[PDB]
């Protein structure tokens, strides 16, 4: 059965892909984001502004709301913290107030940054059973996402609202624009393509997830929505690589050596190891990513080369 | 006996007014900062949400110590006024952290014992370190703002070497706390009892209440033994724990009426059941030695409210 779905942050990277995927499945989808655009089934709403949020829900009825509207990224959160807190937290509270009033089901976008610098396997239950000091969030961005999770749980507890939280991991792929405030993959690709120098912080491990894969699993939440649940959504546990390995994949795909690269040991204040357990998404959400990092990076290099015309 | 130059944000508030007065009485030079204009000397209006206004405070004076109390106080207040809550408690605190990172004053950050959530065991400070995270999930936005603030203080300390002591005040009450329906239980009980107006007692809860003059003495002692990176519960004594009816009965006894005006309920939903505080750390570092137990403190507060509202 097809649903009426709101996607806030629907003009962003995951949001755009998710909107298209949901529409591809036959759902009716309103995309909402912070700017005006040309596109149909689109509405500008600053989620910081209660009146604008209420306006969304006055115009349309929704079965499901994917809430992605956010100031994304740890460095962004430090440099633009006012926008960060107002959007990520007050916006989420406005959305929860709407949810309490209207009873839609919500998919809340948190972040695997909620796990802080935890160096064990990032299973969802780390944010339940582990000593609280394991996951002290390392930047404001990460704290907003954890605050959002707490607010979702308090709302469910107080009003019986129905919410699934997701913790996206290190999503990358075609249609993600470059900026210096994006994740490492688009930074590496854009710099490599332009033969421009960039830094690799060696002492870190990540699992990158291809947008098409992650979006398929996000879209699957509608088909198996379990109120109160939380899911890591990302690649595969065994797709862990260190940062040099990812850089080398980018350089290989561009076809250049690492002469443009400055290597540093570690990025301060940055999660060392971010190795995720996806068994829960595998169980409930038919999580089955098809695009491993080598292949994904190639596709992303190809998209960036074409899109920025290198 | 060393004079400090001290800023107190939230300095026209309940704890803030008492703290400013106590610090001044000790010989410190204290600027009070708050959200409204007042008649007071050594006072400046600054909305801590507004970076420019925060920056103005630090253009005017250099401070050795900053007590950061400016906040939207209270769990119900946080739910009904959440925009102000998040902007002030969190963005305001981040502006203060940015100033601290630039200027290097020492800060006392005011958190809340609500950060312990509904934990049923002894609320030692390290419950926020060693206990499973689910033991202390914060139960309302206000509690989340305080926990977010503590995390931000720790991150600033890690990243910039800023020097901050966090305090978790508990259930502070006393003279100079005005009534509103958004205050804690003690001034609600007192004001309603004084007016012979009905009020509700949620029975299935225990609290340790702390008399403002005692708590401010300990908060003031921090500038005398400031250990960067520390966190302290500051409240009464573990032995002064009572259930809510017991506190209600103290209020009624002090007003001189019976409990005919009281509506009893078994428990308040989404409210911490038991808040058994461990004050060993404050006793150890801060000469914490509260002198006013609840019975006496309630009497003093009843008397103060009686005169101030001319009942
Ligand atoms: N990309 C990842 O790897 C990753 C990792 C962890 C968490 N997340 C979270 O997933 C979501 C999507 O990530 P993304 O990579 O697509 O980020 P993105 O920045 O591309 O998407 C976020 C969108 O939200 C919009 N937005 C910001 N403030 C808004 C406001 N006040 N009102 C309305 N819209 C507003 C932005 O304009 C943007 O289009 C975000 O919530 C992000 O924090 C992503
Ligand atoms: N039992 C307690 O009283 C208790 C318990 C736990 C935590 N706390 C915390 O201790 C502090 C003092 O509590 P209180 O009982 O005196 O509360 P209060 O409300 O009397 O004091 C807070 C003060 O902050 C001011 N303020 C609010 N927003 C501001 C802004 N944007 N800019 C500047 N000033 C602003 C208010 O005007 C007020 O005077 C608060 O941070 C509170 O959250 C108190
Ligand atoms: O220019 C850059 C940006 C990031 N990184 C590293 O890439 C990893 C992922 O960083 P990002 O901010 O993309 O994601 P997160 O840290 O949230 O997983 C971290 O180890 C960073 O140190 C890097 O080496 N160079
Ligand atoms: O009108 C009221 C307000 C509060 N309380 C109780 O008093 C205690 C203290 O609540 P408050 O909000 O003052 O503080 P906190 O919950 O943060 O300790 C709780 O058990 C409440 O249920 C009560 O019985 N009646
Ligand atoms: Cl993230
Ligand atoms: Cl409090
Ligand atoms: Mg438009
Ligand atoms: Mg003035
Ligand atoms: Mg504003």
3D architecture notes:
- Chain B: Belongs to the NAD(P)-dependent epimerase/dehydratase family.
- The complex is a heterodimer of chains A (310) and B (311).
- By secondary structure, chain A is an alpha/beta fold.
- Chain A has a domain at 4-172 and 211-238 and 273-291: Rossmann fold (3-Layer(aba) Sandwich).
- Chain A is built from 10 helices and 13 strands.
- Chain A has helices at 13-24, 50-59, 74-79, 81-102, 140-159, 184-193, 211-220, 243-254, 279-285, 293-307, and strands at residues 4-8, 28-33, 42-44, 64-67, 105-109, 162-168, 171-172, 198-201, 205-207, 209-210, 230-233, 240-242, 261-264.
- In chain A, helix 1 (13-24) links the parallel strand 1 (4-8) and strand 2 (28-33).
- Chain A starts with a strand and ends with a helix.
- Chain B is 41% helix and 17% strand.
- Chain B has one domain (5-308): Rossmann fold.
- The longest helix of chain B has 22 residues, at 82-103.
- Chain B has 311 residues and is of the alpha/beta class.
- At the A-B interface, helix 4 and helix 5 of A face helix 4, helix 5 and helix 6 of B.
- The structure holds nicotinamide-adenine-dinucleotide (2 copies), uridine-5'-diphosphate (2 copies), chloride ion (2 copies) and magnesium ion (MG) (3 copies).
């Amino acid at each position: 059965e097809t649903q009426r779905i709101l996607v806030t942050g629907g003009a962003g990277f995951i949001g755009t892909n998710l909107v298209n995927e949901l529409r591809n499945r036959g759902h009716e989808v309103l995309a909402v984001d912070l700017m005006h655009t040309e596109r149909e089934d689109y509405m500008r709403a600053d989620v910081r502004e209660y009146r604008q949020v209420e306006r969304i829900f006055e115009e349309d009825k929704f079965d499901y709301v994917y809430h992605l509207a956010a100031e994304y990224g740890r460095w962004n959160g430090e440099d633009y913290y006012e926008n960060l807190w107002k959007t990520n937290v007050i916006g989420t509270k406005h959305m929860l107030r709407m949810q309490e009033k209207l009873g839609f089901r919500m998919i809340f976008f948190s972040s695997a940054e909620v796990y802080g610098d935890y160096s064990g396997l990032m299973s969802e239950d780390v944010m339940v059973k582990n000593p609280i000091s394991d996951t002290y969030q390392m930047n404001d961005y990460a704290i907003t996402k954890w605050a959002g999770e707490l607010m979702c749980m308090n709302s469910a507890e107080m009003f019986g609202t129905e919410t699934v939280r997701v913790r996206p991991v290190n999503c990358y792929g075609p249609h993600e624009k470059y900026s210096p405030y994006k994740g490492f993959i688009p930074i590496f690709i854009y710099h490599a393509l332009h033969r421009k120098p960039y830094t690799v912080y060696k002492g870190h491990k990540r699992i990158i997830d291809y947008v098409e894969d992650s979006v398929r699993t996000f879209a699957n939440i509608v088909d198996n929505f379990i109120p109160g649940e939380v899911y890591n959504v990302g690649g595969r546990t065994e797709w862990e690589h260190d940062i040099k390995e990812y850089s080398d994949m980018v350089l290989e795909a561009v076809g250049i050596d690492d002469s443009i690269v400055t290597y540093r040991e570690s990025e301060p204040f940055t999660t060392k190891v971010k190795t995720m357990d996806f068994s829960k998404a595998i169980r409930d959400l038919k999580h089955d990513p098809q695009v491993p990092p080598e292949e994904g990076i190639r596709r992303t290099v190809e998209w960036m080369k074409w899109y920025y015309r290198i």
